[PDB]
């Protein structure tokens, strides 16, 4: 009276754990992709109008 | 400068640039800056003036 | 958008697979019930404990940076707020302590079950109990931590304007902090009758 | 909701900017300022406020209303550039979009100031510093829109906005520049409004759409009134100067375009509630500044919204106008108008 | 601006501005400002001078 | 063994218990957070109005109590020593979904109304009685969820 | 036990019972929320109008009554040994009032917001808003009628 | 095979061991990057603050140390024939510190990014930054504590 | 087949071997690209700084070498009849160095780009950039350390 000859309880446990870890990884990379450098502070800009 | 002049002269630009090896001092700005010597060739009076 | 295309594709695949098994008469194969009986109870317990502290910490961290960034920004003109508003950071950090405490309590139940007793009534009950109890404490602390953090940002930016506003707005903050404590209480109730893995 | 993600980048900006808002002069401080005897007293009184020591380097006999305006404005611009420099991403785009309006005015000032023969040395001192771009003084080279476009303006962020300017005459005068100046503003606001609609989150989106809407309406009414000085103009030409994003659009803008006298314009506005009182009574100029401040004051009640940058800018700009008006009355010893500073806070 | 010793302060404020200006020139030409003895008057001692 | 009480039944009972408490907190969290922004928004302009306008926050807090009551009642019925039937498992699952999403929906409305309510109450002092009246209609949405949750729990164990 | 009455049959009924309240509550909340913004915005200038133009909130609130009424009716019809057919009917009844009530809520929210704002400018418009809201309201009533008809057949002529 | 020791049991140990260092590395990298830009943005005008302001990078580094410590500890308990109970203990230990450290690294980054900028304009504000930043760091420590607790039970009286 | 050595066991070995080099190469590519733009954008005015600004590229390059070492190490351990346990350990080692190296790649890329731009304005900032980069570089080293530990344990006491 098995669950399946292919989708055994052993395989499903591995997959849903993998799905959880992959979801956390994707969310992590989704935040990292949004790191924008604050260019304005790093590059000098000048004009003759200011003091 | 050369970007602007290229359009003004319709691509007939003959243009040379040479470095000055050390900063030049701009006392009114109280800073010193690098500079380049440059030269541009043309014959037309109105073109020279522009 | 690619992500929403993926969601619909998964949904369509699931529906078509379900209908295929159903129409061919083998609809009883999917059998979620058997899946819950055959999966080892240690998985449910450990996911409950790990996500309990995990989601609780995410809550505290998410709240802290919302309040902390506001305190530092508002503090440039008025440094006096930096020490008085540390209370707001505390209300964020504490929900991690609640998650930690539950992790201590639940850890006491992870004994080793005898093989002949592995899937018995009591052991399955403890497996389900610690999973949902851990999720409940974790998620509610995650929600609580963010809500407190958002409130703390408005409190800090108000304090920089007029000191009399701070005590008035902190009332909203303690109201927010109660959510995490109620989560803890329900967590201890759900896990109350669960026996150790026999 | 808004607060969950806003602070990942904008938390520091929002905190500092509201620090500035807490420094806006209150009505009580204005009242005190109006009772100074001399400019040297005004400096001492201002030193009590958030302005602090900003005039500490100026000699007693150097104090003049023009200089106070320059120093008070320079304080604002440095604070603006600091806030911009500490920003990134969509916020950086938003703050740059704020600058475009000023450099559009600089372009028109630069051209008109050289159609009449006076050298760039004077004009650059009259320019608004937030509107600087490195090729700006090169616009003194020529007196022809085609030449000015192909040689300079193509490189500027303003390039997309000239789509309707080249149809004009081959020769430039004050009237023709004023047509160009308004045609640019039309495309600028319509472009700015779209960027806000697309890439700015709530509640800033709704708030910012309101602020730009009022800005478009103010231009529309001013354009209509100014056109009445001309003998005649094609209504289908006027319609190209009115921006499309405002509250007056499309109904009132259509009637404004076809108006030929003050009563026509007054009738055109009478069907729009929010402005129904503007032309019937009092000074029109002050009414707009009154409504502008109230819209800014409303915007500050939001939080976790980048619109506070716009509210702070336009609010403190009005503060400089208040300071200089009071300073002029003090310097000229005539005070019957001194209480006409306009302030919500 | 109405406190009674305002004008006396203005004189000394103006001198303070000028001393700031002098110190700027010392730094422009890179000349070391000389150091006075911190204890030549008093150190919290209450000593009359 | 009783076929109506398979050993996996408690899973759905706990799932309902978790849904009851978590979603109720989400509703309460949104209601107080949105209201807090409104309360703080007027702070610099009219400090007097705060203490007499925390009503949205207090009402938003009641939503958490609705969740607590249902979660407590469910947790009181689950036990390892009783033949907790599968029918009871589904009933307690619906108990969580009802009170959970009812409180979540109510919390969202209380937040939206509360924010603009107090945030414009500073312009018009006669507005307040209207704000309270609208909030009550926003509040009862959560109450309806609790009513059905209590009825489901009453029938499930009998 | 019997094939017509699987032990999992109550699941569909239980989901239908919850569905009736989930979606109606979302409809009522959205209708209340966006109507409230309209009421609060207008009453600054026209506070005397408040109790007249509050009507949309009442209309949105009634949608939740529909969900409660259907939810209780199916709830009193659930049972440990109910047939599978009874489960499907209850699921259909729950979805019918649920998602139809959600549609009504969105309509009331949009119409109420615009109608209240307009009514502050033009008193003739109020009766117009009420008529349009009646048509929005009736979309909820149709869903209820179907739900009640379905529920009436949930146990008629059934055999275990 | 043995019912308590299925052949796939080591997977949860191996992936948990990897997860402990992977998730903490991503958290530490984000903290190092976001605050590192802030240090560059300020030091161009105030270079003397450089070595004073570097603390946020230091604290972000500690989060990775926690990940390395847990990863080493669980790694020393892997084995081919290990029980399934041991496997999920190792997964819980690795996931606990991993998910915890990931959040702590992000918070250190966002607070540190603001902190060093504020330090430039208001000298009293440096200590304020440090106080807040510790309570981001400790959130990684709580993850370590739970990991150590679970790991302590990995081999206690477990029998194949 | 002997259940401790299923036919599919080397699949995790192969993916572990490939993962070690793939993910680190993505990290090294991002570090080289993001910092490369900064170098070019600054050196047009300051060519004299070119060979001092190169360091961020070198460090980003080293990240790739970590993955090459691990990939070669696990590569020599694959086999037709390897144990499943050996497969999981090889997978864990590959992911450990791979995704940890990817995290380090992002950090070096961001701080490298910001660092060289700032270093053009303020020469005292270069030491600060190098100091921060080392903390980012070390994250990849932790990934290598875990990977080597796992690999050392991948083939002891196995009973294939």
Swiss-Prot record, chain B:
It is found in: Vacuole membrane. Glycosylated. Belongs to the V-ATPase 116 kDa subunit family. Subunit of the V0 complex of vacuolar(H+)-ATPase (V-ATPase), a multisubunit enzyme composed of a peripheral complex (V1) that hydrolyzes ATP and a membrane integral complex (V0) that translocates protons. V-ATPase is responsible for acidifying and maintaining the pH of intracellular compartments. Is present only in vacuolar V-ATPase complexes; enzymes containing this subunit have a 4-fold higher ratio of proton transport to ATP hydrolysis than complexes containing the Golgi/endosomal isoform and undergo reversible dissociation of V1 and V0 in response to glucose depletion. V-ATPase is a heteromultimeric enzyme composed of a peripheral catalytic V1 complex (components A to H) attached to an integral membrane V0 proton pore complex (components: a, c, c', c'', d, e, f and VOA1). Present with 55714 molecules/cell in log phase SD medium. This is V-type proton ATPase subunit a, vacuolar isoform. It comes from Saccharomyces cerevisiae (strain ATCC 204508 / S288c). The gene is VPH1. The chain holds residues 199 to 248 of 840 of the full protein.
UniProtKB/Swiss-Prot annotation, chain C:
GO terms for cellular component: fungal-type vacuole membrane; Golgi membrane; membrane; proton-transporting V-type ATPase complex; vacuolar proton-transporting V-type ATPase complex; vacuolar proton-transporting V-type ATPase, V0 domain. Changing residue 93 to D: Partial inactivation. It is found in: Vacuole membrane. Its main location: membrane. Coiled coil: none annotated. Residues 21-46, 107-129, 190-198 are cytoplasmic. It comes from the Eukaryota. The record marks 93 as: Essential for proton translocation. One of its GO terms (biological process) is proton transmembrane transport. Keywords: Hydrogen ion transport, Ion transport, Membrane, Transmembrane, Transmembrane helix, Transport, Vacuole. Residues 68-85, 151-168 are vacuolar. One of its GO terms (molecular function) is proton-transporting ATPase activity, rotational mechanism. InterPro entries: ATPase_proteolipid_c-like_dom (IPR002379), ATPase_proteolipid_csu (IPR000245), F/V-ATP_Csub_sf (IPR035921). The chain crosses the membrane at residues 1-20, 47-67, 86-106, 130-150, 169-189. It is a multi-pass membrane protein. Belongs to the V-ATPase proteolipid subunit family. V-ATPase is a heteromultimeric enzyme composed of a peripheral catalytic V1 complex (components A to H) attached to an integral membrane V0 proton pore complex (components: a, c, c', c'', d, e, f and VOA1). The decameric c-ring forms the proton-conducting pore, and is composed of eight proteolipid subunits c, one subunit c' and one subunit c''. This is V-type proton ATPase subunit c''. It comes from Saccharomyces cerevisiae (strain ATCC 204508 / S288c).
Swiss-Prot record, chain F:
V-ATPase is a heteromultimeric enzyme composed of a peripheral catalytic V1 complex (components A to H) attached to an integral membrane V0 proton pore complex (components: a, c, c', c'', d, e, f and VOA1). The decameric c-ring forms the proton-conducting pore, and is composed of eight proteolipid subunits c, one subunit c' and one subunit c''. NCBIfam families: V_ATP_synt_C (TIGR01100). InterPro entries: ATPase_proteolipid_c-like_dom, ATPase_proteolipid_csu, ATPase_proteolipid_su_C_euk, F/V-ATP_Csub_sf. GO terms for cellular component: cell periphery; fungal-type vacuole; fungal-type vacuole membrane; Golgi membrane; membrane; proton-transporting V-type ATPase complex; vacuolar proton-transporting V-type ATPase complex; vacuolar proton-transporting V-type ATPase, V0 domain. Present with 538 molecules/cell in log phase SD medium. Belongs to the V-ATPase proteolipid subunit family. Its main location: membrane. It comes from Saccharomyces cerevisiae (strain ATCC 204508 / S288c). Changing residue 139 to D: Partial inactivation. It is found in: Vacuole membrane. Gene3D superfamilies: lithium bound rotor ring of v- atpase. The record marks 139 as: Essential for proton translocation. One of its GO terms (molecular function) is proton-transporting ATPase activity, rotational mechanism. Keywords: Hydrogen ion transport, Ion transport, Membrane, Transmembrane, Transmembrane helix, Transport, Vacuole. The chain crosses the membrane at residues 9-31, 54-74, 93-114, 127-152. Residues 32-53, 115-126 are cytoplasmic. The gene is VMA11. It is a multi-pass membrane protein. It holds the Pfam family ATP-synt_C. Residues 75-92, 153-158 are vacuolar. This is V-type proton ATPase subunit c'.
From Swiss-Prot, chains G, H, I:
GO terms for biological process: endocytosis; endosomal lumen acidification; Golgi lumen acidification; intracellular copper ion homeostasis; intracellular iron ion homeostasis; protein targeting to vacuole; proton transmembrane transport; vacuolar acidification. GO terms for cellular component: fungal-type vacuole membrane; Golgi membrane; membrane; proton-transporting V-type ATPase complex; vacuolar proton-transporting V-type ATPase complex; vacuolar proton-transporting V-type ATPase, V0 domain. Residues 32-53, 113-124 are cytoplasmic. It is found in: Vacuole membrane. Gene3D superfamilies: lithium bound rotor ring of v- atpase. The record marks 137 as: Essential for proton translocation. It holds the Pfam family ATP-synt_C. InterPro entries: ATPase_proteolipid_c-like_dom, ATPase_proteolipid_csu, ATPase_proteolipid_su_C_euk, F/V-ATP_Csub_sf. It comes from the Eukaryota. GO terms for molecular function: proton transmembrane transporter activity; proton-transporting ATPase activity, rotational mechanism. Its main location: membrane. Residues 1-8, 75-90, 151-160 are vacuolar. V-ATPase is a heteromultimeric enzyme composed of a peripheral catalytic V1 complex (components A to H) attached to an integral membrane V0 proton pore complex (components: a, c, c', c'', d, e, f and VOA1). The decameric c-ring forms the proton-conducting pore, and is composed of eight proteolipid subunits c, one subunit c' and one subunit c''. This is V-type proton ATPase subunit c. It comes from Saccharomyces cerevisiae (strain ATCC 204508 / S288c) (Baker's yeast).
